[PDB]
């Protein structure tokens, strides 16, 4: 379902920020936005 | 009680300059020789069309004026107060005190019992008996105008007989209904006993006035076209002096 992959994407975003990859976290943020704008 | 207006209450109707000419203008003017209410009391006086205010004082007892439709914080009102350094004019929501005033202690103003609310403050303006101060307050088309004049006087009481043009001092874009007003006096602390002073309030009425502008453009004399048949003749002839003869001024109808 949509909820597992949402959670995995969210987790990557968080992990990237904790590991200092802020810029790549912003890019994953944009994907979350796009994904949830779908039905 | 009441006093005679004489020729006082004349102000420049507009910012137009006229020199050595007689101009007939219909506007809210204080009728000549009308009854002006005198006080030596700060009631909630009706503002009506406009208010002519004469202050005969040496101790600056008159410290300001409040103008409001309901005189409460429910609707915004316009208040002018004088601290000498900067007159404060505020079109804002204020909840006035039952007996608003500025309390002076021996002399320095120490108490400000005027309002408890300063909210929705739309407009704030800080600006700059041997002394007579005349002020015409008119609220028209949303603009409120104060016409002010200073006169050196030596009469003990009541309005001195004289002519003084009332120059427009300030005009502000207010835009709120003004139905009642109240002057604020400097009630000194003894229990409150105020110093000797007098203030006179007159209600302007729609009147036609013939004003004589001199070479300087100052109104040196005025004729109230409805005051008396001689004044009606002067207004009809558009001249301050009428020649010998018969003149038709108006029509009498029952």
């Amino acid at each position: 379902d949509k909820l597992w992959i949402l959670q995995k994407i969210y987790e990557i975003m968080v992990r990237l920020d904790e590991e200092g990859h802020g810029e790549a976290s912003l890019m994953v943020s944009d994907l979350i936005y796009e994904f949830m704008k779908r039905d | 009680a009441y006093t005679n207006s004489f020729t006082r209450g004349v102000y420049y109707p507009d910012k137009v300059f006229r020199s050595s000419v007689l101009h007939s203008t219909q506007d809210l003017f204080l009728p000549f020789f009308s009854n002006v209410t005198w006080f030596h009391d700060n009631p909630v006086l009706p503002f009506n069309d406009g208010v002519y205010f004469a202050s005969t004082e040496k101790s600056n007892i008159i410290r300001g004026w409040i103008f409001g439709t309901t005189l409460d914080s429910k609707t915004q009102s316009l208040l002018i107060v004088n601290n000498a350094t900067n007159v404060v004019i505020k079109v804002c929501e204020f909840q006035f005190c039952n007996d608003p005033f500025l309390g002076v202690y021996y002399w320095m103003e120490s108490e400000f019992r005027v309002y408890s609310s300063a909210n929705n403050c739309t407009f704030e303006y800080v600006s700059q008996f041997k002394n007579l101060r005349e002020f015409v307050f008119k609220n028209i088309d949303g603009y409120f105008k104060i016409y002010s004049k200073h006169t050196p006087i030596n009469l003990v009481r009541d309005l001195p007989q004289g002519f003084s043009a009332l120059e427009p001092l300030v005009d502000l874009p207010i835009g709120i209904n003004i139905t009642r007003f109240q002057t604020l006096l400097a009630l000194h602390r003894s229990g409150w006993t105020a110093g000797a002073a007098a203030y006179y309030v007159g209600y302007l009425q729609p009147r036609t006035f013939l004003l004589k502008y001199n070479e300087n453009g100052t109104i040196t004399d005025a004729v109230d076209c409805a005051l008396d048949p001689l004044s009606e003749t002067k207004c009809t002839l558009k001249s301050f002096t009428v020649e010998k003869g018969i003149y038709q001024t108006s029509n009498f109808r029952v």
Partner: protein, 232 residues
């Protein structure tokens, strides 16, 4: 016939306080400054701030100088460079949808400048946040500062972030080394409500001209006068 036209008009709004403020708000908590009872020189918008980029959606900044308005609103916040394009009428995106939304019929000005030197920090500036989740799009000029946990699935979150239960704000974490697209931009939006907020030709003498003095339109020759006008 008149040789030329001369227009005469009389000879400050705290725009310095707005554009050169030390702190700016996060976009999700965008700041609104009401400006009123003042005169502003909108001609110099081109230089109200530095390295600016501006666009007006109503009339030119010059025409703003003629105009008057009851109130002016200044909205300000920080976002990413690549998100500045969303602060425009008719846009959709993470910012337009969940943070700050202009109406389709907006007629104001949008000004944005790169604030990398001020708002980025080594290690990350975590002050600046944006909303990433919301149950509906924002209406124009709506502001949402709630921080309720966003429940993405069917299980309750009982007020704590967890699986499919997301804190609704995210930090930009700005760092000096980000690309320009990801660097911080300070943004000011001016909207003009409708007049206590308001925005001259050389005088010629002894020449037949069509003159405009404070709305008095006339034709004639202007010469020196000995008339003592009263000040009013």
């Amino acid at each position: 016939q008149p040789t030329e036209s001369i227009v005469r008009f009389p000879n400050l709004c705290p725009f310095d306080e707005v554009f050169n403020a030390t702190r700016f708000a996060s976009v999700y908590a965008w700041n609104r400054k009401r400006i009123s009872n003042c005169v502003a020189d909108y001609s110099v918008l081109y230089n109200f701030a530095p390295f600016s980029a501006f666009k007006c959606y109503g009339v030119s900044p010059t025409k703003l100088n003629d105009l008057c308005f009851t109130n002016v609103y200044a909205d300000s916040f920080v976002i990413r460079g690549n998100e500045v394009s969303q602060i425009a009428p008719g846009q959709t995106g993470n910012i337009a949808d969940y943070n700050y939304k202009l109406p389709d019929d907006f007629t104001g000005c949008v000004i944005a400048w790169n604030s990398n030197k001020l708002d980025s920090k080594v290690g990350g500036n975590y002050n600046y946040r944006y909303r990433l989740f919301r149950k509906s799009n924002l209406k124009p000029f709506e502001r949402d500062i709630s921080t309720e946990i966003y429940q993405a699935g069917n299980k309750p979150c009982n007020g704590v972030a967890g699986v499919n239960c997301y804190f609704p704000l995210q930090s930009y974490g700005f760092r000096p080394t980000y690309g320009v697209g990801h660097q911080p931009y300070r943004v000011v939006v001016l909207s003009f409500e409708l007049a206590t907020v308001c925005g001259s030709t050389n005088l010629v003498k002894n020449k037949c001209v069509n003159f405009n003095f404070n709305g008095l339109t006339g034709t004639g020759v202007l010469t020196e006068s000995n008339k003592k006008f009263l000040p009013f």
